[PDB]
Amino acid sequence: GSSGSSGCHQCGEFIIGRVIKAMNNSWHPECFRCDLCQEVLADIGFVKNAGRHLCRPCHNREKASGPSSG
Ligand SMILES: [Zn+2]
Ligand SMILES: [Zn+2]
Asked: Where is the LIM zinc-binding domain?
């Protein structure tokens, strides 16, 4: 049949206690980290970009539109 209801995608292990819902999936409070700084995006939150989980800080630095804008 099936094993577990909500398991982490990062590592895979089953989450017990705190389940971080993101990218339409369950993850751990330590697994779900940024893709540029690997910062826990459980409480601080995350930002979906280019199919990657980033933190306001980074995401902002990346998305940051060039300084030269006509
Ligand atoms: Zn995990
Ligand atoms: Zn980051």
From this structure: 8-58
Pairwise CA distance, residues 41 & 68, whole Å:
31
What is the distance in A from the centroid of ligand 2 to the CA of 16? 26
**Separation between Cα atoms, residue 42 and residue 3, nearest integer Å:** 24
1 CA → ligand 2 middle, Å: 38
SS3 61: helix
CA–CA separation, 51 and 41 (whole Å): 15
- List domains and CATH numbers for the chain: 1-70 (2.10.110.10)
Cα of 33 vs centre of ligand 2, distance in Å, is 8
Residue 23, helix vs strand vs coil: coil
* First-last CA distance in the chain: 59
